[model samples]
Structure formats: structure tokens, C-alpha cells
Target: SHMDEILARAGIFQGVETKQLQPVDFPRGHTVFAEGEPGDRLYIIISGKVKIGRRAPDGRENLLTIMGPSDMFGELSIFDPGPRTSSATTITEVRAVSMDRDALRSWIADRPEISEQLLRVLARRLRRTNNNLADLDVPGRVAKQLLQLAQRFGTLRVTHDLTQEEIAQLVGASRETVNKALADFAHRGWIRLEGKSVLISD
Candidate 1:
């Protein structure tokens, strides 16, 4: 089944029975969870995409990461019995598997290898965050984000149901900056923009 396949690819639920997973669905623009809310569950994306973000003190949204199919998030809840650090919102209608803290605990206890896999995922996220912060230029950051998304979705043909403003939000840039960078990429023959979608040519 597709559920088992996604779980297997996750590499965190190895040796666990497939029947344990509980599938859930979310509509586009749905808030999966909010920052500072009680955290108890982890989610594995079965399809579609979600944006994880943090709200600034001034009520601005600081985009964190965009996760897609087979990607997992909210795992920090399983390790730390505290409030969530960021919020998750569905970028598109989504299907995912939800596992509560108790289930995650037992599953990890039964298969300790999952702990190592989870750590690696967290480490990679941290590294990407660091890299984004290190690059001070807006265009550089936008380019990096585009490459990362292409790699994650495993396609040069990137389809986003988001507007240019939304793309700017995800890349932590102004709409003008994102637009200029995108145009530059297109001019360079690196990507072709078809409406809201971007197809990487090289």
C-alpha cells in the first residue's frame, strides 16, 4: 500500500507493523498546529505540501521550511514534552499519518535505530537553516531555496500552487527581490517560468 511505502521510505518506522499508522487529511490553508501550542503528535506527509513557520514578535510570519510527500515533521514533540516551536500549515490539500507521543515512544523502544534516523533528519534541517542564515544576499538565498526544493521533490519541473509573494515569504525575501531573482534565472536559461510554475531547464 502507499502508506506502507511512504513509511518505509521514511526509514524511521522500520520493523514496525503497518497497521499502527492512522491517516489524516488536511485542506489547503489548514493549520496543522501553531507555535507555542501543546505538542503531542508527529506527522508524516503522504501527499501534498506544508509550510512550517514561526511568527515574529511583531506578528510577521517567518517561513521556515516547506515539506512535501514522504517528508516528516513535528518529531520534536516526541522527544520534548513541550510546546511546539513553529506552526505547520497546509500549502495544498494533504494526507498524512499521525502518531502520538505514546505510540512514538513505544515504537522507538522496540526499534532503537529510529532514534538515529530522526537525529539525522533534525541535523539536516539545522544545517539548512544555518546555511540560509549565513547567506546574507536575497538573490543567493532565493537561488538556494529553489535548488533545495528541486532536490527535495526530485524534479527540475517544479510546480507550486503559490503566488510570487508566497515564494518570497518562503525564501525570506521581498516580493520584488524574489521576482527579480526568478527573472534572472529565467534569463540565464536555468529555469522557465510558466505562469506560477517554474521548470528548471538546467
Candidate 2:
């Protein structure tokens, strides 16, 4: 289930007082929070998408995840008491609600079920977003890219014919990494890798 549904089921914001949370809105490309920034609140999206990214040592942002409606980010700060592990940027005009730490802590303290669901939600996304760069691996990134591209074309083939090196650049990985990933995918009966081409299997 999506984060929003979890939030709704937990009654996390069914009638939350305005004083405990603030409505946040921003234009596309706005930086909601920077990497390593200390934060005391978490945001739940009502509309639009947010990009969760971490900077590589090479100084380029490595995108970790894209959060859309029914998604939430920055929830860990409310519990962990540490700087944000990734930066959050808006992909479109965002309509979200930022829940403050004090209120959230008290709210959850009053309800065991809400706190439990939140723990599960945070644990899932933390792995998906925060640990992505740490150990998600190049093959995972490649597979995600391939699957996303395939889904975009709404077909079983990745028709772009983008070069291996080019696709590596797109995924911020190396050509060797891309080759290994594709090679693995091919072995798994996922695709047939051609020269700068890939076809998804049924």
C-alpha cells in the first residue's frame, strides 16, 4: 500500500490541528530541503512529485527516488534526530503538509497503532530512498532504468537505442556496470541485449 493510505489508515492527519502542521506549496525545481540539513518535520504530499537525491562524491546529485501524490518524505527526522540523508526537490508545483516533530511525537504517543504503521512505512521508504545509494547496487539502478524506460514506451522494447555508455551516463553508472547489469538481466530472461538496444521479455 502507498504511504498516503497508510497515513489515512493510521488517522495521522484526519483532523490534525493546523498549529501542528503547515501547508507547504512550492513551484517546480524548488529545493524543499538540502542534503545533510537538520530537520524537525516530515512532509506528506497531496499533489505533485518530489525528487529525493543525495550528492555523490563527484559533486553530482544521485537521484534516490521520486515521490508523487500519496507519498511522503523526510519522515525519519521526526524519529531519528539527525540531519537529512538526502535532499528533497520538487519536480512539479507541490501541495503538501509538513508535520512538525513535537506534534507528531505526541500524536503517535497517544496511539500505538499509528506509531506501528508509521514505523513500517518509514522502514520501507528508508530502504528505498536512503539506502539506495549505499547498497542498492548498480544492477538495481540499471534494472529500474530499463523498466522505467520500457514502461514509458508502453511496449516490451526499449526503442531508444541509446548507447551503453550513454545509458550508463543516464544512470550515473559506468559502461562496465551497465554491461554487467544487462548481461545479468539477459541471463534472467528479462531482456535480450543488442548493440545499444534492449528488448523486454513477456
Winning model by TM-score: 1
TM-score of each: 0.85, 0.60
RMSD of each candidate?
2.6, 7.3
Q: What is the per-residue lDDT of model 2 for residues 1-202, given as tens digits with 9 covering 90 to 100?
A: 2434534533244433322334677898799999898988788777776777888898766665566665678887777889999988886788887777877777677755567667676566567676556443789888878887676443576554455755665587877887898888899898898754578875
* Residue pair clashes in candidate 1: none
The lDDT per prediction is: 0.80, 0.70
Off by over 4 Å in 1: 14-20, 123-133
Residues 71-168 of candidate 1: C-alpha lDDT, one tens digit per residue? 88897866878899899999899999888978877767877888777887788778978885464378888888777777776457777656677778
TM-score of 2: 0.60
